[PDB]
């Protein structure tokens, strides 16, 4: 029933970089998804108390959300693009694991994921 602490967005000893791919992930990928009309359920960690989802964190053991990803990008938490791409994919997969096909939240995730896939297709080559 209770909420876990959110995923880490700061860790001083963790290796990190500012690469042109990571800059694209923030300026193009995150910003495109964040402004979408269906972004709002994904802009912060799932609040299992408020949403009355006492099973959520018993089923979803690797939670992820765009609020976390935004903070990780802004605070240069990542080493490479793949780490960030994996976070987006975790977020989508979590939604499909927890919910039913055709549920509103799944339809919203699908719409965001289509855009994500389009933008990652244009990920720039490493400089
Ligand atoms: C990632 N995520 C996010 C939400 C969510 C977050 C903030 C607000 C809201 C809300 F309620 F205001 F719309 C939803 C939710 S809500 C939800 C939910 N209640 N899912 C049920 C759908 C019907 S079911 O039979 O599949 C049981 C779970 C799942 C998720 C989610 O994964």
UniProtKB/Swiss-Prot annotation:
Post-translational modification: Phosphorylation by CK2 disrupt the intramolecular binding between the bromo domain 2 and the NPS region and promotes binding between the NPS and the BID regions, leading to activate the protein and promote binding to acetylated histones. In absence of phosphorylation, BRD4 does not localize to p53/TP53 target gene promoters, phosphorylation promoting recruitment to p53/TP53 target promoters.
Site (Acetylated histone binding): 99
Compartments reported by the entry: Nucleus; Chromosome
Tissue specificity remark: Ubiquitously expressed.
Cross-link (Glycyl lysine isopeptide (Lys-Gly) (interchain with G-Cter in SUMO2)), chain numbering: 58
Bromo domain span: 17-123
Mutagenesis / variant outcome for changing residue 104 to G: Found in a patient with a neurodevelopmental syndrome; uncertain significance
Disease link: Cornelia de Lange syndrome 6: A form of Cornelia de Lange syndrome, a clinically heterogeneous developmental disorder associated with malformations affecting multiple systems. It is characterized by facial dysmorphisms, abnormal hands and feet, growth delay, cognitive retardation, hirsutism, gastroesophageal dysfunction and cardiac, ophthalmologic and genitourinary anomalies. CDLS6 inheritance is autosomal dominant.
Subunit text: Interacts with p53/TP53; the interaction is direct. Interacts (via CTD region) with CDK9 and CCNT1, acting as an associated component of P-TEFb complex. Interacts with RELA (when acetylated at 'Lys-310'). Interacts (via NET domain) with NSD3, CHD4, BICRA and ATAD5. The interaction with BICRA bridges BRD4 to the GBAF complex. Interacts (via NET domain) with JMJD6 (via JmjC and N-terminal domains); the interaction is stronger in presence of ssRNA and recruits JMJD6 on distal enhancers. Interacts with NSD3. Interacts with NIPBL.
Note: JQ1, a thieno-triazolo-1,4-diazepine derivative, and I-BET, a benzodiazepine derivative, have been tested on tumors with success. Treatment with GSK1210151A (I-BET151, a I-BET derivative) has strong effets on mixed lineage leukemia and promotes myeloid differentiation and leukemia stem-cell depletion.
Its job: Chromatin reader protein that recognizes and binds acetylated histones and plays a key role in transmission of epigenetic memory across cell divisions and transcription regulation. Remains associated with acetylated chromatin throughout the entire cell cycle and provides epigenetic memory for postmitotic G1 gene transcription by preserving acetylated chromatin status and maintaining high-order chromatin structure. During interphase, plays a key role in regulating the transcription of signal-inducible genes by associating with the P-TEFb complex and recruiting it to promoters.
Family as reported in the entry's similarity comment: Belongs to the BET family.
Domain notes from UniProt: The NET domain mediates interaction with a number of chromatin proteins involved in transcription regulation (NSD3, JMJD6, CHD4, GLTSCR1 and ATAD5).
Entry protein name: Bromodomain-containing protein 4
Residues of the full protein shown: 44 to 168 of 1362
């Amino acid at each position: 029933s209770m909420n876990p602490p959110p995923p880490e967005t700061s860790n001083p000893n963790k290796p990190k970089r500012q690469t042109n791919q990571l800059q694209y992930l923030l300026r193009v990928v995150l910003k495109t998804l964040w402004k979408h009309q269906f972004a709002w359920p994904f802009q912060q960690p799932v609040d299992a108390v408020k949403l009355n989802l006492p099973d959520y964190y018993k089923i979803i053991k690797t939670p992820m959300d765009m609020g976390t990803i935004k903070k990780r990008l802004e605070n240069n938490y990542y080493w490479n693009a793949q780490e960030c791409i994996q976070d987006f994919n975790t977020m989508f997969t979590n939604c499909y694991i927890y919910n039913k096909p055709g549920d509103d939240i799944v339809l919203m995730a699908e719409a965001l994921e289509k855009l994500f896939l389009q933008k990652i297709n244009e990920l720039p080559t490493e400089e």
